[PDB]
Design a protein around this ligand. Structure first.
Ligand SMILES: COc1ccccc1CC(=O)N1C[C@H](C(N)=O)[C@@H](C)C1
Ligand SMILES: [Zn+2]
Length: 140
């Protein structure tokens, strides 16, 4: 589990969105595994607007933050899970790192801010849904 809280937005994995998220929906995209809902309170996270390919992510199944090198956002084939069939997921970045299904939502960050959230993994890989192109998260 986990979310990004920037401005009056909450960014979560679409597959973990709650009824309150759907009832306060701003934007969702199944191909990216992302959903954004509105919040009453202002958040403290800031979004990175950069080209970093190194950062640090939070892994709840180890209670640890790990440094990682990750690929550029791309269209990658992801195997079937409890939440989606096997399909291509867009804007996904892969790294070598520990992950388990409930690690989705952990933040990946660089010196500029939040880069994305854990969305996929297995066998010593972890995949992150990028948010750096969603410029509207920084306003209104
Ligand atoms: C945290 O991910 C794992 C880690 C180890 C093993 C398996 C997983 C699960 C995993 O790969 N997915 C990909 C799915 C997607 N974003 O399409 C999502 C619903 C679950
Ligand atoms: Zn950066």
């Amino acid at each position: 589990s986990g979310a990004i809280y920037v401005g009056n937005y909450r960014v979560v994995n679409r597959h973990l969105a709650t009824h309150n998220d759907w009832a306060n929906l701003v934007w969702e995209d199944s191909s990216r595994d992302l959903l954004v809902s509105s919040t009453t309170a202002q958040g403290c996270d800031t979004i990175a607007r950069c080209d970093c390919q190194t950062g640090v992510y939070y892994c709840s199944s180890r209670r640890k933050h790990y440094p990682v090198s990750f690929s550029k956002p791309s269209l990658i084939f992801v195997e079937a899970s409890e939440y989606y069939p096997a399909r291509y997921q867009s804007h996904l970045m892969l790294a070598v790192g520990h992950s388990e299904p409930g690690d989705c939502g952990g933040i990946l960050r660089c010196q500029h801010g939040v880069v994305g959230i854990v969305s996929t993994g297995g066998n010593g890989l972890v995949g992150f849904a990028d948010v750096r192109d969603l410029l509207w998260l920084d306003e209104e």
